[PDB]
Every structure is written in structure tokens, then in C-alpha cells.
Design an enzyme around this catalytic site. Sequence first.
Site, mmCIF file in Angstrom:
data_model
loop_
_atom_site.group_PDB
_atom_site.id
_atom_site.type_symbol
_atom_site.label_atom_id
_atom_site.label_comp_id
_atom_site.label_asym_id
_atom_site.label_seq_id
_atom_site.Cartn_x
_atom_site.Cartn_y
_atom_site.Cartn_z
ATOM 1 N N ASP A 167 4.985 28.126 -5.198
ATOM 2 C CA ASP A 167 3.724 28.595 -5.796
ATOM 3 C C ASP A 167 2.518 27.790 -5.313
ATOM 4 O OD1 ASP A 167 4.889 30.617 -7.310
ATOM 5 O OD2 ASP A 167 4.438 29.725 -9.234
ATOM 6 N N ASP B 205 8.796 27.895 -14.705
ATOM 7 C CA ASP B 205 8.715 29.334 -14.491
ATOM 8 C C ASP B 205 10.188 29.765 -14.610
ATOM 9 O OD1 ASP B 205 9.060 31.807 -13.137
ATOM 10 O OD2 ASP B 205 7.658 31.295 -11.548
ATOM 11 N N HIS C 279 9.994 29.629 -6.246
ATOM 12 C CA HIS C 279 8.909 29.589 -5.289
ATOM 13 C C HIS C 279 8.043 28.369 -5.563
ATOM 14 C CE1 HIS C 279 9.744 33.507 -7.195
ATOM 15 N NE2 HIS C 279 10.092 33.894 -5.972
ATOM 16 N N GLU D 227 6.352 33.271 -16.820
ATOM 17 C CA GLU D 227 6.905 34.413 -16.106
ATOM 18 C C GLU D 227 8.047 35.119 -16.856
ATOM 19 O OE1 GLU D 227 5.666 35.823 -13.120
ATOM 20 O OE2 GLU D 227 4.047 34.339 -12.906
ATOM 21 N N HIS E 293 2.560 32.473 -14.379
ATOM 22 C CA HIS E 293 2.445 31.092 -13.908
ATOM 23 C C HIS E 293 1.082 30.698 -13.305
ATOM 24 C CE1 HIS E 293 5.465 27.726 -12.626
ATOM 25 N NE2 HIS E 293 4.632 27.309 -13.572
ATOM 26 N N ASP F 249 10.899 26.237 -10.402
ATOM 27 C CA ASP F 249 10.593 27.554 -9.889
ATOM 28 C C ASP F 249 11.348 27.793 -8.604
ATOM 29 O OD1 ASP F 249 9.137 29.898 -9.229
ATOM 30 O OD2 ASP F 249 7.219 29.018 -9.831
ATOM 31 N N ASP G 263 11.810 32.171 -13.412
ATOM 32 C CA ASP G 263 12.449 32.691 -12.201
ATOM 33 C C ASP G 263 13.107 31.565 -11.332
ATOM 34 O OD1 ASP G 263 10.345 31.772 -10.429
ATOM 35 O OD2 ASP G 263 9.630 33.781 -9.976
ATOM 36 N N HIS H 35 -0.723 34.018 -9.281
ATOM 37 C CA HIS H 35 0.406 33.364 -9.974
ATOM 38 C C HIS H 35 1.256 32.481 -9.040
ATOM 39 C CE1 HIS H 35 4.497 35.323 -9.492
ATOM 40 N NE2 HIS H 35 3.759 36.055 -8.653
HETATM 41 C C1 LIG Z 1 18.103 36.654 -2.176
HETATM 42 C C2 LIG Z 1 17.236 36.022 -1.106
HETATM 43 C C3 LIG Z 1 16.105 36.886 -0.630
HETATM 44 N N1 LIG Z 1 16.247 38.150 -0.398
HETATM 45 N N2 LIG Z 1 15.011 38.594 -0.062
HETATM 46 C C4 LIG Z 1 14.814 40.020 0.209
HETATM 47 C C5 LIG Z 1 15.746 40.539 1.278
HETATM 48 C C6 LIG Z 1 14.100 37.588 -0.084
HETATM 49 C C7 LIG Z 1 12.650 37.886 0.127
HETATM 50 C C8 LIG Z 1 11.928 37.858 -1.224
HETATM 51 C C9 LIG Z 1 10.444 38.172 -1.036
HETATM 52 N N3 LIG Z 1 9.811 37.222 -0.104
HETATM 53 C C10 LIG Z 1 8.393 37.546 0.088
HETATM 54 C C11 LIG Z 1 7.457 37.034 -0.993
HETATM 55 C C12 LIG Z 1 7.714 35.601 -1.387
HETATM 56 N N4 LIG Z 1 6.320 35.011 -1.794
HETATM 57 C C13 LIG Z 1 6.295 34.375 -3.164
HETATM 58 C C14 LIG Z 1 4.959 34.352 -3.999
HETATM 59 C C15 LIG Z 1 3.660 34.161 -3.199
HETATM 60 O O1 LIG Z 1 3.453 33.193 -2.488
HETATM 61 O O2 LIG Z 1 2.758 35.130 -3.323
HETATM 62 C C16 LIG Z 1 4.932 35.519 -5.009
HETATM 63 C C17 LIG Z 1 5.780 35.036 -6.148
HETATM 64 C C18 LIG Z 1 5.350 33.668 -6.332
HETATM 65 C C19 LIG Z 1 5.072 33.122 -4.934
HETATM 66 C C20 LIG Z 1 5.333 36.174 -1.555
HETATM 67 C C21 LIG Z 1 6.014 37.040 -0.531
HETATM 68 C C22 LIG Z 1 5.285 38.367 -0.596
HETATM 69 C C23 LIG Z 1 5.324 39.159 -1.737
HETATM 70 C C24 LIG Z 1 4.581 40.325 -1.812
HETATM 71 C C25 LIG Z 1 3.795 40.726 -0.743
HETATM 72 C C26 LIG Z 1 3.782 39.932 0.372
HETATM 73 F F1 LIG Z 1 3.033 40.320 1.443
HETATM 74 C C27 LIG Z 1 4.499 38.769 0.476
HETATM 75 C C28 LIG Z 1 10.470 37.308 1.213
HETATM 76 C C29 LIG Z 1 11.949 36.950 1.117
HETATM 77 C C30 LIG Z 1 14.764 36.444 -0.430
HETATM 78 C C31 LIG Z 1 14.321 35.017 -0.600
HETATM 79 C C32 LIG Z 1 14.361 34.210 0.717
HETATM 80 MN MN LIG Z 2 5.740 30.446 -10.544
HETATM 81 MN MN LIG Z 3 8.485 31.732 -9.656
#
Ligand SMILES: CCc1nn(CC)c(C2CCN(C[C@H]3CN(CC4(C(=O)O)CCCC4)C[C@@H]3c3cccc(F)c3)CC2)c1CC
Ligand SMILES: [Mn+2]
Ligand SMILES: [Mn+2]
Lengths: 317, 317, 317
Positions: free
Chosen positions: A126, A230, A124, A275, A99, A122, A232, A139
Site C-alpha cells: 500500500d 488490513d 499489499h 478493508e 485502508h 497487509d 486482506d 486505499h
Molecule cells: C494469487 C496470486 C495472484 N494472482 N493474481 C491474478 C492472476 C495476482 C494479481 C492480483 C492483482 N495485481 C494487480 C493489482 C495489485 N495492486 C494493489 C493495490 C494498488 O497499489 O493500487 C490495490 C490494492 C491495494 C494496493 C494494484 C494492481 C492493479 C489493480 C487494479 C488496476 C490496476 F491497473 C492495477 C496483479 C497480480 C496475484 C498476486 C501476485
Molecule cells: Mn491496505
Molecule cells: Mn490490503
Amino acid sequence: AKSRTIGIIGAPFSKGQPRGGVEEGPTVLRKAGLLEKLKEQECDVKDYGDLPFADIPNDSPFQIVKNPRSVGKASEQLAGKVAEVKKNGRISLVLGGDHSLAIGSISGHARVHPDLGVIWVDAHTDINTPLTTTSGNLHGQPVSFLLKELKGKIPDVPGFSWVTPCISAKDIVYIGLRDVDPGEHYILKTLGIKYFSMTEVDRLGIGKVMEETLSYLLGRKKRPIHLSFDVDGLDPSFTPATGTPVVGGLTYREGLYITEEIYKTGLLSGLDIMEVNPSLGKTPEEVTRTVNTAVAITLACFGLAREGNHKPIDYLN
Amino acid sequence: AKSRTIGIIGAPFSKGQPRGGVEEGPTVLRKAGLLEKLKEQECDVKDYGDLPFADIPNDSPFQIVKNPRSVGKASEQLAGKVAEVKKNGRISLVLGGDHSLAIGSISGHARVHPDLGVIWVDAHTDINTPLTTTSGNLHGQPVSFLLKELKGKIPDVPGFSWVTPCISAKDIVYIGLRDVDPGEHYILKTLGIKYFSMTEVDRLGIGKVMEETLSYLLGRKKRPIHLSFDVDGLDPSFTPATGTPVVGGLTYREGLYITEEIYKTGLLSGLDIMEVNPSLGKTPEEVTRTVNTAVAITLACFGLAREGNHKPIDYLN
Amino acid sequence: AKSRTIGIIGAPFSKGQPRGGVEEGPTVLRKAGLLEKLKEQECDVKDYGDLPFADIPNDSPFQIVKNPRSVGKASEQLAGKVAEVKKNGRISLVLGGDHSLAIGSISGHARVHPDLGVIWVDAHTDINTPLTTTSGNLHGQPVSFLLKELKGKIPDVPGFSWVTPCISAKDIVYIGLRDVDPGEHYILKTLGIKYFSMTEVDRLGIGKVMEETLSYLLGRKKRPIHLSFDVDGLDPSFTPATGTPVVGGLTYREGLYITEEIYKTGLLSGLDIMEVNPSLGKTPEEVTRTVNTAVAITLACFGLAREGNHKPIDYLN
Ligand SMILES: CCc1nn(CC)c(C2CCN(C[C@H]3CN(CC4(C(=O)O)CCCC4)C[C@@H]3c3cccc(F)c3)CC2)c1CC
Ligand SMILES: [Mn+2]
Ligand SMILES: [Mn+2]
Ligand SMILES: CCc1nn(CC)c(C2CCN(C[C@H]3CN(CC4(C(=O)O)CCCC4)C[C@@H]3c3cccc(F)c3)CC2)c1CC
Ligand SMILES: CCc1nn(CC)c(C2CCN(C[C@H]3CN(CC4(C(=O)O)CCCC4)C[C@@H]3c3cccc(F)c3)CC2)c1CC
Ligand SMILES: [Mn+2]
Ligand SMILES: [Mn+2]
Ligand SMILES: [Mn+2]
Ligand SMILES: [Mn+2]
């Protein structure tokens, strides 16, 4: 037919996210028979091919933000292809790839019809900036580069010299959100971006979500629309083969109503199916399932309806 | 009561489509104690029997239509027994089998109740004619033979000489549509028939689909309802053991919400439980799942409320 | 925020039902990281430990109602700890355990905030008396013990000597019900209890289900709300490792919206996640899916939004 005249740009790019395989997205989506499928659905299709990305050795990360010179060049070269397609009179169709190619997609399209509205499907937003970014992945940063409002807050990232924000805050709507970074919630809320997370769809239903989405975007004049889907954004029981799955999102029916509705507007002029990672599936059926959903979403965008479709010929004779 | 008085018809017949094992639908639904359960829900139940089907030697096709005399006499056998059950002051409960049986089911019912209203919960419209058919399957052609508006537009097909159409285009509603053929879609638009495809359900919710349906069939005055229920109308993740399954459709909940509503009126006078094939299981649990879903639908037609059910007595005594 | 100051109490009590394993509920809810995920969510999480439930051997039954001395003891022990948490300005977060403990939680909450309104999210009404009950399992008898109107329909049963009905048959709303006994339905109607069976959740969406629930109880004043949640209310496809799984229930997204709109009020004082049995999932993944959904349910009641959650700082600094 304008709504059935398409330009197929396939973008095999993956250096916007840290997982290999999303580059084979165009390949697998084409093997499912989407070109022939669109052609059997009364379409004027033309394939432009896969865009090549001649490897960039020496691409050190911008702070924590990884692969910047590659993310940029691929979007700048795609932005040239989307502009070249839109000039040929066809709805640009970008098969990703990750993306982060949305910078190129919306960019090239906006060069021809600068008055575009964006629907973003999406989980996220993004909407991250290279300074707010928690992961560093480009992305999940396309939207920050494209907003006229974030200029000044967008820093000098090597590879993005060509970028000029083309969409204003009022011209993009969010649908399917359920995984937003704190920094992304600040951008969403303080900029006043029309969002509809999963809470919104649970409260109103996809019917009222599209009712408000097409009114918010097309309220004054019927301008062209770019859909940046996307995969996802859908539930991981329909699109399991993807880099960042988040459970509890858009259903198969929901994904079809979004796309079937945007078709009826008759203003779809750009589409992104991003994606789709075929090598990130736990089982072969999770892969087939993912591509079948991404191909069904695509056919819904270019004419397919669940009630049926027929030609201006007498079928009872 | 007139809503819990049932005439159990069995229909072991599959020659209306090309997939064997659907003639074992009346067997398996009875194994899962369908009759034992209804008598518990305070239903006066009678077993007319599973109808024997005369084996026609050498059934030459009518053009691309396979087995016309078998479908033609199996539905003629059903019509005679449906009329009998309906005349015995009882609500017909046909256990199929394929959908081609709805010719005799609806015909038999309209002999006793000529003002009948038809609700068709199914993924397919099944309104193809013996000329507009492409699959040649007779399970996809009933509504055509039954409709009065198509008189002159149906040919002389062997086995249907006794067929006198009995429904009007305004006497039918569709609920669940998503796999329609051009010729079938054509007749729906050029005949002003009320259809609620998955797009319409996704837009209006099963509450407004059931709202609009009942105020439409029972407009000017109260009349008898004939619900023709095909288990493919629901999603194949609740009913996998069925011949022509289509992904992303009616839920196990929406199918129940529809049936609970027709009971609340107290006007259900004809019921069809079609396309249950225990030979199309991919694990003995998918047959057990399809058959459970079939019994849940039927029990809900006779008062099996999900809010609760009780006898008219003091329970705190 | 006061809707963020929490008090954790974990009941390893399982003698209120035949299936064994519901006593390991708070331990599996602690390995998952409940306090940790809440501290991140900006919560004042202070643990009050696990309750010491002593063994009552030779605990003779009363009529069809098994283990009566043990259940009354467990809830009497819980009513005193729930009271300490309520008196210290903390939301009583009880982690079960079986739904019998809702006697002690709701009573313990009524001893401090006696004007509370209840929302029973269950697949069953849990409103059987020691007489009406057909199972004789107390995890399906709590509500009637707490109702003031049914003062005289509960006999002198050993252990529940302390019980005094705290809530009225108007200070409660049911949601997600699809397995209500004839006796349970008799109480629900001849008492006039607000209910949202699966029929209404299909009819009005979970959006109008929450406007009608939240208005019926929060009309006149901003009063305390106690959510007595049972994971069997959610479809067995989301929380499968539970004692009494009933097919066709609330989804992941409906259960998330419920807990999201309840946080939005800021009037939540009690919360009970009940019936997570880790020994009742066909695969080790089914156990994980029941627990992850319970965590997702809990975290949503203390701030976790799907649109995002930032802190009160400037993300562009
Ligand atoms: C089912 C519900 C749920 N269960 N869980 C897990 C128990 C969550 C978690 C899933 C992951 N997010 C962390 C990542 C969400 N961000 C998204 C993105 C970004 O801005 O970079 C990457 C994809 C596109 C946009 C990046 C961030 C991240 C990822 C890697 C390293 C870092 F330092 C931070 C936390 C919650 C959820 C959603 C609430
Ligand atoms: Mn995306
Ligand atoms: Mn996405
Ligand atoms: C994205 C989901 C999807 N993926 N695909 C596959 C790319 C479909 C297709 C599934 C089948 N339909 C057409 C068949 C369904 N018709 C209806 C029926 C009839 O009247 O004969 C048969 C069932 C009962 C009514 C007969 C027709 C047929 C079948 C066999 C031979 C023939 F020449 C025509 C095309 C699309 C879907 C559903 C949209
Ligand atoms: C669609 C799936 C379905 N298939 N079937 C089978 C045809 C049902 C039935 C499942 C059982 N219920 C009755 C039980 C539900 N009750 C409530 C509870 C209780 O009081 O203990 C259970 C937990 C908390 C509340 C106690 C009762 C019971 C239990 C044990 C013994 C006894 F004599 C009665 C009838 C329907 C369904 C649900 C529609
Ligand atoms: Mn059918
Ligand atoms: Mn069908
Ligand atoms: Mn319960
Ligand atoms: Mn329960």
C-alpha cells in the site's frame, strides 16, 4: 490498565476504493459484540461513535487518482479524532472503512506520541504514490504520504494540504506481503524498508518474524506502536469478505500470534482493522467468518491469550 | 513388538457432556476397519470389547455437575479393564466416547506403570475441579481428580470414592490449548505444569514442541508414555464431528507428527481416542473426515510412517 | 537472465495411468495463459508445440505393468524434443501429462547437461520397478528406470529399449512424500536417497527443507537442477483435480517457497508440471484451483516473487 484502555473510533469510509460496502464495516463489527466482548475481557472501553462524512460533490480525479478531496477530508477529520482520543489516555482503535484512513490514523496518533513504530499487516505494501499508482485508488497509497523520505516525490493532490510526513523509513515493518506493484517494489527495496513477505514467513515462521519485528522496532527504546491491520493480509479462507483478496497468506493462528505478541510488548497505543466489506461476500457464512476473524484479532490485541486468562483472586476457593 | 502389541478397549459412554452421539465413537471407528488395518501394519491385536455401561436411575447432580455416579462408575469400569489389558503385556487403546473416561484410563494404567508420563493433545485443559467447573460437564474435570497436587482441593463427589490420584504436576504436557477457563489457567500457573498452547506451537513449530516434550517427560530415565488424544485438539476443519470444537488449531499434519514421534521412542503404553461424535456431522463427509483423521492418528501411534513402511525382506527379489 | 529463457513442450500423454483426462493437461495450461503470464514476467518464451503421440493399439501388458510400449514411445519422443530445447539455450518446460514422461525429460536433459541433480516433489516416490510395483502403472515407476544403481533390477520391457539410467541414487532429493510403497521405501533406504517426507517438512519447516535440499545437491559446484513437480504433492485442498490425491500434503505457500528459492540459484534447466487432470475435480472450481496453482507454481520458477518485481529503471522519474 493501559493495554486495556481503548477509544473506539468507527470510520465508515469507502471512497478510497471502487467497491461499495466497506463503510458498513464499523456497523457489522459492532453487531458481533466486540464492545461487550472487550468489556468481558477486563477492558476499560469507551465508544466515540461513527465519524460522519458529509458528501463532497465535485471531486474530479487528480489525473488517474480517483476521489482525492473525499479521501483527504475523511483522514484529516479522523486525524482530529485520533489526537483527541490519545489525549484522553486511550489506545485509539480505528474500525474501517477502507485502508486509506491509515493516513488519518497514524497522523493523529503521531501528533501526541511522534516516536511511533508501525506494524502493517497487509498482502499489499500500500506504498504507492499518486504518480506510480497503477489503479489510482488511494486505499493502496496511504504509506507514501506518511514517509519523511518520499517528500518531493509526493505531489499536490487536492485534499491532502494538511499532510506532513510523520514516520521515517526506519520506523515501519511489513508482514504478510504477496501482491506488490513494480513501482511499490522499487520504493520497498530502494528505501530500505524492513519487509517480511509470505516468503519470509514460510522460511522462518511467524515466531521468528515477530522476534525480528519487535527487535527492529523496539531495539533502542520502548516507544509506542501503531498496528495498521488490513484484513486482506490474512488468507481468504479466514477473511473472505474483503475488497482485494489474495490467496496464500496469513493463517488464523498466524494472525493471532502477531496480535498476541504485540500485546505482550505492552506498547500498543493505536490499532486499525481495515478493508472489511460485509456486502462483498459470496455467502452469509463468508461474512460471519470474516467478522469473527477481525473481532478475534482485535481481542488478541487487547489481552486475549490462547493459554488462558485469570484474575488476581484464588480460584480454588 | 512391545510397540505393536495392542489391547482394544471400546468405551460407549457420553454422560460426561451435554451433546449425544459421542457414545457412538467406538461403533464408527470399528466400522472404518480400525482393527483390520492394525493387523496389516504387523500389530498383534486383541479385542477386549466395547464396555457395557450400567444405567443409573435418577442421577442427582453434585452442585452444578451433571451425572456424577454415571461418570464415576463408567470410569471405575474402565480402570479395571485398563489395568487388565496393561497387565496382559499389552498397550491399551481406548475408543471413546467422552474425555471424562481418562480418569479410569490413567488410573488403570498407573496401577501397572506408576511412573507414567501424560501427553494431552486437546484444545481444552480439562483440569477443572467439581467446584471450579462452570459448564458442570465431567469431561472437563479429569486431570483434577488424577493430580496429586490438588489433594484436599477436590470434594467428595458421588462415584469417585475409589479415586486415588496418581499423577504429579511435572508428569504432564499440554499440546493444542486455545479455549481455557480462568480457573483452569490459574492452576496451570500456580502448579508449574508444562503447557504448549497454540501460541507456543505457532512460535516453536511442531518439531520443537515434540523436541521439548520428549526430552522433558523422559529426562533422567526411560519410562511409559500415556497419550490422551482428544480429536478437538486438532482443528475442526479436519475433525468437525466433535462436541466442543474451536477454530484455528492443530493441523492434520501436526497431529500426525506428534503421534509418529511417540512411536519412534517405542514407549507408548496407554492411548485414548476421545470425543468422536458421528451425530455432529453437517454432511456425512464431515463424519467420514473426522473418523479418517481419528484412524490416521492411531495408525501413526503403531508405526504408520508417512515416509514409508516395509517388511524386513529383499524387495528386489 | 538465462533463468528466464524458456522452451515450452506439451505432452498430451495419459496411457501411464488408469484415470483418463491427464492428456488435456497442456491445453488447459495454455487457456490459463502460461506463455502470456511469462512474457509479462520478462521471459524469452518460444513455444516448441505439442508432441504427436501415436496410438499403439493391442499394446499387451508386461506382468502387472500395463501399456508398456506406449509409455516408452512417449518418453522416447520427449527425450529428443527436450534435447533440442536444451541445445538451443532454453529451460525445458514440459507440461504433462502423467509422471511417466519424467523418464524422457530427465534423460533428454541428461543428454545435454549430464551432471544434473533432481528434486522430486511428489506425494509418492515414483520409484517402483516393473516387478516391485503393486499398481503396474508407469506414472509411479520413472525414477528406478533412471537410476544407475538399479541397473539389473529392471527387466527387458517392450518400448524402454532406448533407456540407459542417467541419474544416480544420490543426484536426487524427494519432497512432500506421504504415500511410499514398501518396495519404494526399500529402494529409498538400501540406496540412501535424500528425502523430505511430510514428517521432515513438519519438523524443520520448508525453510530448512530448502537449505538442506539446495546444499545436498549444490555444495561442491553450481550444477543444473531439474524440478520434476507433481501437483499431487500439494494437498488435495490446493490441486484437487489430480489422479492420486493424498490428504495432508504440501500447502500453497510451501509449494511457492520451494519454486521461489529454486529460481534464486539460477541453475534451473528443466521443469515438469505433471498430473493436472481437468476431468477429476468434483466441481468446475476444483479444476480451476488445480490449474491456477500449477500456473502459480510455474511462474514462481522464472522470477515471480511475493515481495514484488520491478524492472531496471527509475520508478521516481
Ligand atoms: C494469487 C496470486 C495472484 N494472482 N493474481 C491474478 C492472476 C495476482 C494479481 C492480483 C492483482 N495485481 C494487480 C493489482 C495489485 N495492486 C494493489 C493495490 C494498488 O497499489 O493500487 C490495490 C490494492 C491495494 C494496493 C494494484 C494492481 C492493479 C489493480 C487494479 C488496476 C490496476 F491497473 C492495477 C496483479 C497480480 C496475484 C498476486 C501476485
Ligand atoms: Mn491496505
Ligand atoms: Mn490490503
Ligand atoms: C474465538 C473463539 C471462541 N469464541 N468463543 C465464543 C465467544 C469461544 C468461547 C468457547 C467457550 N469458552 C468457555 C467454555 C469451554 N470450557 C472448557 C470445558 C470444561 O471444562 O467444561 C468444556 C469443553 C471441555 C472443557 C467450559 C466453558 C463453558 C462452557 C459452557 C458453559 C459454561 F458456563 C462454560 C469461552 C470462549 C472461543 C474459544 C476461546
Ligand atoms: C491417509 C490416506 C490413505 N488411505 N489409504 C487407504 C488405507 C492410503 C493407501 C493408498 C494406496 N497406497 C498404495 C498405492 C500408492 N502407490 C504409488 C503410486 C504407483 O506406484 O502407482 C500411485 C501413483 C504414483 C505412485 C501404488 C499403490 C497401489 C495403487 C494401486 C493398486 C495397488 F495394488 C497399489 C497405500 C496407502 C492412504 C495413503 C497413506
Ligand atoms: Mn477433552
Ligand atoms: Mn477439549
Ligand atoms: Mn509422481
Ligand atoms: Mn504422485
